Amino acid sequence: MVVALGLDFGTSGARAIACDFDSDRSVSVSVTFPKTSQNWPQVWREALWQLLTQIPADWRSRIERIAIDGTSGTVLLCDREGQPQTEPLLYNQACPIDLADLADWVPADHAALSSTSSLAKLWFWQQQFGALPPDWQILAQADWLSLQLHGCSQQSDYHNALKLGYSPDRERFSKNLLDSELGALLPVVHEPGVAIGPILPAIAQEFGLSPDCQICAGTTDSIAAFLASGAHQPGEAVTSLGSTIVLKLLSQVAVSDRLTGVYSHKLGGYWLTGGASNCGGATLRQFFPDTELESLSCQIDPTKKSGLDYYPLPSRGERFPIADPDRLPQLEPRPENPVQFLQGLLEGLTQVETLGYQRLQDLGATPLKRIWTAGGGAKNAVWQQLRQQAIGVPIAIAPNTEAAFGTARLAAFGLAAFHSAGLKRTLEH
Ligand SMILES: Nc1ncnc2c1ncn2[C@@H]1O[C@H](COP(=O)(O)OP(=O)(O)O)[C@@H](O)[C@H]1O
């Protein structure tokens, strides 16, 4: 097999992981971003070079494929040569545009129809600049960074391109969009993991990389995190028990529900759907520090219900599994015993995950087969028991959770595992 390099540019820093997949060995390096910047592109690019520099020379001489994940909806408006013409619009920033202005360019309830989408941001830039030059380009963070390595302009992947208006189901931008004032700025879209081009000669020599090293189409940090688990059978899921509960479910068919923010990414011959609740670990942290979560959790017997019926929102408003912007946290009655209170909370969170996966199924997704767990709550075995009892499928801690590692797997193996040849055997004599 191959020594491959994955680069993860996330919300607060970047990480690089190089893996020798025959020896199953690896090296990891990282850089931390400032909270603010006058020149984010400079920060990101310098981070890229820092990461490469930190990798030992002998590893660098062996890297054959490279891939990059970036944050979703972080975009840059660049000239022909890839120089940013204005500040980037970050993944979390929303644009004050009329979504009706986009209606002719994507299907109804397409995921791009959101004030934070790459498409919303390109349109905002169009209105702000008046008329965008056709030789210019819009690039996602991942796009721009890989451009620093392979020199090929206007290149993206069908994960990052989704919220720019790509329709992975028909593998195209709508003709209406391509023919519009914005068409000339759109990227050519490839499958994540496919080789875009060889590394730039000068970059290869500067950093001691093979000049035959290939740079692959990238992905988003969220998807990269899913790729880290190794899951590739429809029905397999990764639950992230973090500040919020985030569900990702591998499915044979695409599902969507704009009301609850549910949409699907293409993933080889399959689809990755999911959803994000406002409930999660942040609610727990409002009441208990991690050490207390531990010390109290081991006093809980999950085989006996608490009698408490909580909905553990950290504040007003729920998004998923069921949308209600007015929904109140339901945290009463609060019993005297903190152990029982914590059990009530864990039971509530468990209901959020249970209803979440069952909901995805009810929208048409492949029925849940098993769950891999990531995030701060993953090692809570009492919570794991409650979840297993409520959901009725095997649950375990994900083998790997690092987005950089998922992206390294993407560089090494692409999306080959995500096709029906790998399904469970049904052969019987
Ligand atoms: N033993 C535990 N059981 C349940 N939740 C925990 C435990 N330890 C930490 N957490 C929760 O994990 C959350 C942070 O998860 P993490 O994924 O590390 O951060 P983030 O979600 O912000 O990326 C915190 O809100 C904390 O309450």
- Read out DSSP for 96-152? ---GGGGTTTS-TT-TT-STTSHHHHHHHHHHHHSS--TT-EEEEHHHHHHHHHH--
Cβ(282) to ligand 1 under 6 A? yes
| Structure tokens that stand for 121 in this block | 């941001």
205 plus 325 within the same structural domain: no
Which runs of E-coded beta strand occur in 232-318?
A: 236-241, 245-251, 264-267, 270-276
Q: How far is CA 288 from CA 143, 293, 295, in A?
A: 41, 6, 10
Q: Are residues 183 and 250 in the same domain?
A: no
Give CA separation, 14 vs 31, 56, 69, 306, 370, in Å: 5, 17, 10, 42, 30
Sorted by sequence, the CB contacts under 8 Å of residue 341 that are 6+ apart come out as 287, 308, 334, 335
Q: Which residue has a Cα nearest atom 10 of ligand 1?
A: 376
- My answer on whether 94 and 183 are in the same domain is yes
Residue owning the nearest CA to atom 23 of ligand 1: 242
- Elucidation method: X-ray
332 lines ligand 1 (CB under 6 A): no
Give the residue whose CA is nearest to atom 19 of ligand 1. 242
Q: Are residues 202 and 235 in the same domain?
A: no
Q: Residue 242: which H helix or E strand, with range?
A: none
Q: Clarify whether residues 98 and 153 are in a common domain.
A: yes
Nearest to 256 by CA among 164, 114, 358, 360: 360
Would you tell me the crossing angle of helices 338-362 and 381-391 to the nearest 10 degrees? 40
Asked whether residue 155 falls in the same domain as residue 301, the answer is no
Residue indicated by tokens 């950290």:
314
Give me the domain span that covers residue 174: 1-230
**Domain end position, chosen among 230, 265, 295:** 230
Q: Give the span between the Cα atoms of 186 and 109, in whole angstroms.
A: 21
**How many C-beta atoms surround the C-beta of residue 290 within 10 A?**
11
Q: Which two tokens stand for residue 380?
A: 């809570």
Q: Is 261 exposed, middle or buried (0-12, 13-18, 19+ CB in 10 A)?
A: middle
Whether the CA torsion 191, 197, 199, 200 is positive or negative: it is negative
- Ligand 1 centre and the CA of 380: distance in Å? 10
Q: Is any ligand 1 atom within 6 A of the Cβ of residue 293? A: yes
* Beta carbon of 377 within 6 Å of any ligand 1 atom: yes
Report d(CA 13, CA 29) in Å as an integer. 11
Find tokens 């986009």 and name the residue: 102
With a 6 A CB cut-off, is 243 part of the ligand 1 pocket?
A: yes
Q: Which of 143, 92, 112 is nearest to 265 (CA)?
A: 112
> Is 12 assigned a ligand-binding role in the annotation?
yes
Where does a domain end: 230, 249, 277?
A: 230
The ligand 1 atom nearest the CA atom of 240: 17
Region label for 64, one of left (φ > 0), alpha (ψ between -120 and 50) or beta (otherwise): alpha
Virtual torsion, Cα 248, 249, 254, 256, nearest 10 deg: -50
CA distance 356 to 359: 5
Question: What kind and span of H or E run contains 207?
Answer: helix 201-207
Whether 266 and 328 map to the same domain: the answer is yes
Q: Give yes or no: residues 211 and 358 share one domain.
A: no
Q: Which residues contact 277 (CB under 8 A, 6 or more apart)?
A: 244, 245, 246, 247, 318, 319, 320, 321, 352, 356
Coil/strand/helix, residue 16? strand
In terms of domains, do 184 and 238 share one? no
Q: Whole-angstrom Cα distance, residue 26 to residue 17?
A: 7
SS3 assignment, position 276: strand
Do residues 46 and 173 both lie within one domain?
A: yes
Between the CA of 285 and the centroid of ligand 1 the distance, in Å, is 8
Angular region, 321: left φ>0, alpha ψ -120 to 50, beta rest = alpha
Query: Residue 9 pairs with which residues in a beta bridge?
Result: 14
Residue nearest to atom 7 of ligand 1 (CA): 377
Strands annotated E in 335-382: 370-374
Q: Do 241 and 348 sit in the same domain of this protein? A: yes
The C-alpha atoms of residue 22 and residue 301 are separated, in whole angstroms, by 43
Token pair in block for residue 302: 């999950």
Distance from residue 390's CA to the centre of ligand 1 (Å):
21
Same domain, 160 and 217: yes
The CA distance from 136 to 424, in Å, is: 47
Q: Alpha-carbon distance 70 to 52, whole Å?
A: 16
Q: What angle do CA 230, 233, 237 make, to 5 degrees?
A: 70
Classify residue 24 by burial, with Cβ atoms within 10 Å: 0-12, 13-18, 19+: exposed
Domain count, the chain: 2
Q: Is the CB of 281 under 6 A from ligand 1?
A: yes
Residue where one domain finishes, among candidates 179, 214, 230: 230
- The reply to whether ligand 1 has any atom less than 6 angstroms from the CB of 407 is no
Backbone CA torsion sign across 190, 193, 199, 200 = positive
